[PDB]
Design a protein around this ligand. Sequence first.
Ligand SMILES: CC[C@@H](O)[C@H](NCc1c(COP(=O)(O)O)cnc(C)c1O)C(=O)O
Ligand SMILES: CC[C@@H](O)[C@H](NCc1c(COP(=O)(O)O)cnc(C)c1O)C(=O)O
Lengths: 399, 399
Amino acid sequence: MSNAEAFYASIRTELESIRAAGLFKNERVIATPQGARVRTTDGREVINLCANNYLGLSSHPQVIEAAHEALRTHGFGLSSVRFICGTQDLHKTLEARLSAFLGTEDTILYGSAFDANGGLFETLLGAEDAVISDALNHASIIDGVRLSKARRYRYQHNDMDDLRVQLEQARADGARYTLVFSDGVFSMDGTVARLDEMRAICDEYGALLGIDECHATGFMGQRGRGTHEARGVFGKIDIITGTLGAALGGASGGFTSARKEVVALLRQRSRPYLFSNTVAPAIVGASIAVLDILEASTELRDRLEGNTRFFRAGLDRLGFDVKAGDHPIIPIMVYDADKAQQLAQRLLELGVYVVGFFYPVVPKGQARIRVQMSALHDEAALQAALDAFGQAGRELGLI
Amino acid sequence: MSNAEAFYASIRTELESIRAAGLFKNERVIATPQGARVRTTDGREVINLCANNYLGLSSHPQVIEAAHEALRTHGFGLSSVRFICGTQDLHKTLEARLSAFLGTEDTILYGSAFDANGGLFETLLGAEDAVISDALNHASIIDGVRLSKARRYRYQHNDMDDLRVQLEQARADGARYTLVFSDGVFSMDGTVARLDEMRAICDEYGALLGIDECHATGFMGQRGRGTHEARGVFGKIDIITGTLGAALGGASGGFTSARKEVVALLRQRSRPYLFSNTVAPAIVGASIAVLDILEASTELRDRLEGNTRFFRAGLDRLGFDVKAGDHPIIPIMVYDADKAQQLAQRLLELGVYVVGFFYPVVPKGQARIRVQMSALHDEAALQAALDAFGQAGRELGLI
Ligand SMILES: CC[C@@H](O)[C@H](NCc1c(COP(=O)(O)O)cnc(C)c1O)C(=O)O
Ligand SMILES: CC[C@@H](O)[C@H](NCc1c(COP(=O)(O)O)cnc(C)c1O)C(=O)O
């Protein structure tokens, strides 16, 4: 029995036990563009309440046509990293508009938020330095930190007192520079970081504050600029990392926006920036028009707030443990992974597209459905969906 | 002086330190689509010989039109990882086409080749297993290995006897499974991994064989299938990672190709596939068009081979060191960084766009210019660049 084939057997044995534990993820094949309603290849058309299409720009006609013109004017692929021959005027234009949009002096584009985080800490920090992370920080942040030589501390989830204990200890352990880093809005539970307390606690110790803004840019704040606008620190952030693939288009790309020494050093030394393809001209192009939309009127994010409150207060009145609020991410815990596959399946049958969240996406035994609001939803969809949740929740024992 | 501001000072000190060493990289701002000739925002038209656009597909109008069609039928962005609502029929289809093209059972799409490597080793390997890398492996492989728990070995560049010395130690050290991993075609020197030998070495020790094919897929091997085709080992590769951002379109996205059960574990556990956006609809649909183009005729790859055989023989007949290979990557070693900044800039005055490679992209003391050949270059541009190389080659002491 060969060594290579025992490996493949090991892998097959692993797959089985993932299925046994109710943890195997099955892909639905959508046959349509992204939007408020969606159709799998099988033919069924369902309400989509689990996309990152927070502002509904993934298939917004003026975003689609801006990408079209980018294809005409600036081509399909650049097949280069930025410093070689992958820099077009659009990249410089969009890095500018984001810096303006976000409150920072420059911005550096990446292929994703995942790679913006991956290349952040290693380039800026060393073994003598520290990174303090909220316990539930996103996997891409944990992997950025793992790739750096910095010392690591976690503070308990959104616990501002534990943030002080770690900052105390890191000072005590002798940290040169400290960077406090956290999801702006957290992926799996929707809660909002307390950037107002943190920027103050960071100011006592001289620490830096960085935030991952994927679940905030475009629709958090009065003018949609970020979680920092929503906590009144706009322009007081050392490091923003974020995506172009959530609210701002949903195609690809990410970014780090920081002072200008940072951005300049990231361009010089950040590994994904040096070593991975530049963003495609269509994406950069359509993102520049995305910023034209959101800077011209706050309506879409306003309709998002409305859709979110209506549906959060609705799931509340049905007995779900969902607080009233304006978090477009609405977590619905079912703990059992199998009971998550069922609830998502049953809600499919009832006309609602959600997907189970289980390990390793969330901790074993803390499985959930993550509802996700859009500006796209009209009230007969939000209503027909509330119906779907009340029934399937009743059948499965959730209310 | 506060700690935060102290940190910014260290950033600018190293920003100035990097300029002082002449190691600072300045972005040239292309104003046109990627092409064999390109115009900076200054209006000057120049011959591009430093892109990964080997087959000219980056602005190929049939590729461009497939992106136009994929936007109309399938939208701009999906704003979701694959397992939630980011799997369209296109991704499944493109995944079947890459597997058949490449000789493998299945294929998993990533947002870049960077992330394909980044999510590869940590998923398939454990503390008891070994990875054995060619010492010149791409930065994305190193980081993917650093993110895994496996035991690490490096062997001298293309050194088959060093490769055996490591597999001895890996086994001596008690490795369970063992993965030999190397660039198929090395980005920085154009050399071609000795895959037929490595397959034989691996069979002996019972190790898996993996290749990163970013500089091979589409044009290496008689049918452009890649380094494994070119070395008689088509169909006998355990793991292919790669990119859609070079010869297969140049826009965005990457992949890992392997057996069904390896790919299935990557879908269930690979961190960038779980936690980062799915490839955009327009990119997937254009990639499907790229495979129709390349499966229909080995022109382009035949044309590429010609253009390089001519341009190598060009610098051949001028006292340039044609160091190693038939390959479209022509490394013109100049060792000193400042000279490569000079030679790249001087050629820009002679009408040639080409860029200096120096630390940390290439080792200190081993700076260079990477000439990269495309199918697109017409004879006018070719021998016109041969002249600009001859002039500046003598003009700056290298000829
Ligand atoms: C100067 C920067 C170079 O590293 C670059 N190559 C990028 C690259 C990647 C990342 O591919 P992605 O773009 O992330 O899909 C993965 N593997 C290999 C073997 C590569 O050569 C180039 O040839 O310009
Ligand atoms: C189930 C997978 C989720 O983690 C996923 N997160 C994507 C994500 C990334 C990667 O962003 P990119 O897509 O690579 O730009 C970076 N930071 C944060 C805070 C994120 O939430 C989501 O919420 O859909």
